[PDB]
Amino acid sequence: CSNSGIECDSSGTCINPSNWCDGVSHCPGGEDENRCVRLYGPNFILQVYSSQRKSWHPVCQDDWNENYGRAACRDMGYKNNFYSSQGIVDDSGSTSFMKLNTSAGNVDIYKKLYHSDACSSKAVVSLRCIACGVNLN
Amino acid sequence: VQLQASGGGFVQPGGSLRLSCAASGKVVEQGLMGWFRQAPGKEREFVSAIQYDTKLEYYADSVKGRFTISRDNSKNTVYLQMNSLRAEDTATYYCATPQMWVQRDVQARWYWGQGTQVTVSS
Amino acid sequence: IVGGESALPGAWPWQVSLHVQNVHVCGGSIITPEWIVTAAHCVEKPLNNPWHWTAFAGILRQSFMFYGAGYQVEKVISHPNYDSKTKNNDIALMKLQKPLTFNDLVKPVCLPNPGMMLQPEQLCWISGWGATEEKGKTSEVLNAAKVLLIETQRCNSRYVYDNLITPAMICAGFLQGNVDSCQGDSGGPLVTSKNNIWWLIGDTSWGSGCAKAYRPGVYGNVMVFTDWIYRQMRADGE
Ligand SMILES: *[C@@H]1O[C@H](CO)[C@@H](O)[C@H](O)[C@H]1NC(C)=O
Ligand SMILES: [Ca+2]
């Protein structure tokens, strides 16, 4: 794709990043709205793609709780699975965060978040949706 | 399980052949038997398969309607009736079980006894 | 697995034996109580039919995988861009009819996250019931062995695999050979430990012979496939 467009598919379709994870399904297979939440790095930093900023950003811990964590895990495809979540300090030299709108209403979990330059709790969300990766010592 | 294919030969367009695959080994290993084919310089191709109790049969699109697969479980033999043959059906035909045909190394050779040559030319 | 050793119970609790009509055909990795990651070259037609497949977890020996002791597979999904001629995008998912019960012997492996920052020659493990020598039979017992990642630039060299390694592929093993996956290990796990977590980084895809010099194992690049995996799981859940 040209001009930083994002591939919807392997069929050549290109979409403007401002419509990626913006709450409206624009791609033929809805690819722009079903991969908006991810866990980054070996420490499971919760990140959401911001349609405002056209990039991934960590999630502030302000007002976050297990119900929001379960919504994030369900959006990722883990259904009713939930393991663990805790606030951690940011280690990536980030000035850019996704912050929870407590009065957002009934929208996608990634649309309950808005871009922000600071977290009041000084911590970002670490989230694991399933207990995995453990074997015999 | 040990498989011996036979029945191959030379025919002209429109002719017919009936291939046989005789199995020696535990019947549990014959739950699904399949036929594949390979012409020189080309990728191996699935042809047909049959469940042990014969209640499910499979056919590749290119041979659907013309070929018929069957079993005789007291002989432990699978048969492939091939009618209305064309030149593009020319290949070495192989019988195999799933544990054989699903290959980490697809270019690894199948046993000679699994195959039988079929040539269609006028 | 060539050049490894038999596994202990609970050593690789995500490993499953995938049977067609109660005969081992491919390996797989548990990622949720109902989802298993395996290879697309395991499930080409007529093996795309879930009716034929059962999964055996927490069992180390094939002689203890009886009729009825395994979990019936409900769905089989191959990668839509899988190419059988090159084995590009060689990954598939199986969904179980009934969820697994996790315990000391049956546990999931973690899907890799973006930004793992693995070493160029990161230390990994492979496991499966594949042959223990080239042209050998299926192993009755689960085996496992250490392998290292080999940088794709090296694997694509003229004297190795000569530009056959795509971005949907990773190489692991030893250019000297001796240790490798083999026939019957298809679909099984390539895992690595980082931050005290075991991560699924590959699924056994292809190779040229087993454990031969300059012919190491090639694995589906699971990190590249994670978006697709999440989409299938999300589409299933609702
Ligand atoms: C939060 O959502 C409400 C309702 O949509 C809206 O009125 C308000 O402006 C939002 N606040 C922020 C900071 O986006
Ligand atoms: Ca959109």
Write down all domains in chain B, each with its CATH number in brackets: 2-120 (2.60.40.10)
Query: In the numeric block, which tokens belong to residue A8?
Result: 């919807």
Whether residue C159 sits in one domain with residue C88: no
Query: What is the tally of structural domains in chain C?
Result: 2
Residue B27 CA from chain centroid, whole number: 18
A113 bridge partner residues = A100
Taking the C-alpha atoms of residue A15 and residue A35, their distance in angstroms, rounded to an integer, is 15
C104 noted as active-site residue:
no
DSSP run (H or E) holding C26: strand C23-30
Domain span at C34: 13-108+225-238
B58 bridge partner residues = B49
Taking the C-alpha atoms of residue C40 and residue B102, their distance in angstroms, rounded to an integer, is 10
From the candidates B104, B105, B106, B112, which should be mutated to test the interface with C, based on the most C CB atoms within 10 A?
B104
Cβ neighbours of B72 (radius 10 Å): 12
Interface of A with C in 64-123 (CB under 8 A): 74-79, 81
Query: What is the tally of structural domains in chain A?
Result: 2
Residue nearest to atom 12 of ligand 1 (CA): A101
Whether residue C22 sits in one domain with residue C89: yes
Q: Is C45 on the interface with A (CB under 8 A)?
A: no
Taking the C-alpha atoms of residue B93 and residue B90, their distance in angstroms, rounded to an integer, is 9
Whether residue A103 sits in one domain with residue A48: yes
DSSP string, chain B: -EEEEE--EEE-TT--EEEEEEEES-GGGGSEEEEEEE-TTS--EEEEEEETTSS-EEE-TTTTTTEEEEEETTTTEEEEEE-S--GGG-EEEEEE-HHHHS-SSTTSPPPGGGEEEEEE--
Taking the C-alpha atoms of residue C144 and residue B11, their distance in angstroms, rounded to an integer, is 50
Whether residue C39 sits in one domain with residue C62: yes
Whether residue A60 sits in one domain with residue A7: no
Determination technique for this entry: X-ray
CATH of the domain at A19: 4.10.400
Resolution for the entry shown, Å: 2.0
| Those residues with Cβ within 8 angstroms of residue A106's Cβ, 6 or more apart along the chain or in another chain | none
Angle in degrees, CA A5, C111, A53, rounded to 5:
30
> Tokens 């046989």 label which residue?
B20
Taking the C-alpha atoms of residue C32 and residue C57, their distance in angstroms, rounded to an integer, is 13
Cβ neighbours of C114 (radius 10 Å): 14
Contact C59, C69 (CB under 8 A): yes
Please name which ligand lies nearest the alpha carbon of A19: 2
Please name which of C99, C101, C98, C81 lies closest in space to residue C89, comparing C-alpha atoms. Answer: C81
Q: Is B34 on the interface with C (CB under 8 A)?
A: yes
Taking the C-alpha atoms of residue A32 and residue C21, their distance in angstroms, rounded to an integer, is 40
Name the CA dihedral angle for C211, C212, C214, C217, rounded to a multiple of 10 degrees: -30
Query: In the numeric block, which tokens belong to residue B41?
Result: 């310089």
Domain span at A9: 1-34
| Those residues with Cβ within 8 angstroms of residue B9's Cβ, 6 or more apart along the chain or in another chain | B17, B117, B118, B119
Whether residue A74 sits in one domain with residue A22: no
Taking the C-alpha atoms of residue A27 and residue A33, their distance in angstroms, rounded to an integer, is 8
Please name which of B54, B101, B111, B44 lies closest in space to residue B77, comparing C-alpha atoms. Answer: B54
Q: Please give the sequence-ordered ranges of beta strands (E in DSSP) within A6-102, or none if there are none.
A: 6-7, 14-15, 37-40, 45-50, 55-58, 84-88, 97-100
Taking the C-alpha atoms of residue A116 and residue A127, their distance in angstroms, rounded to an integer, is 20
Taking the C-alpha atoms of residue C120 and residue A102, their distance in angstroms, rounded to an integer, is 44
> Tokens 């084919």 label which residue?
B37
Interchain CB contacts (distance < 8 Å): A and C: 85
Report the length, in residues, of chain A: 137
Whether residue A97 sits in one domain with residue A72: yes
CB-neighbour burial class of residue C85 (10 A; exposed 0-12, middle 13-18, buried 19+): exposed
**CA A51 – ligand 2 centroid, Å:** 9
Q: Is B46 on the interface with C (CB under 8 A)?
A: yes
Contact C44, C26 (CB under 8 A): no
Taking the C-alpha atoms of residue C205 and residue B98, their distance in angstroms, rounded to an integer, is 16
Whether residue A53 sits in one domain with residue A20: no
Contact A40, C113 (CB under 8 A): yes
First to last CA, chain B: 37
Per-residue burial over A61-72, b = 16 or more CB atoms within 10 Å of its CB, e = otherwise: bbebeeebbbbb
Taking the C-alpha atoms of residue A106 and residue C16, their distance in angstroms, rounded to an integer, is 40
Taking the C-alpha atoms of residue C131 and residue C183, their distance in angstroms, rounded to an integer, is 6
Tell me the shortest Cα–Cα distance from C194 to chain A, in angstroms: 7
Taking the C-alpha atoms of residue A115 and residue A132, their distance in angstroms, rounded to an integer, is 31
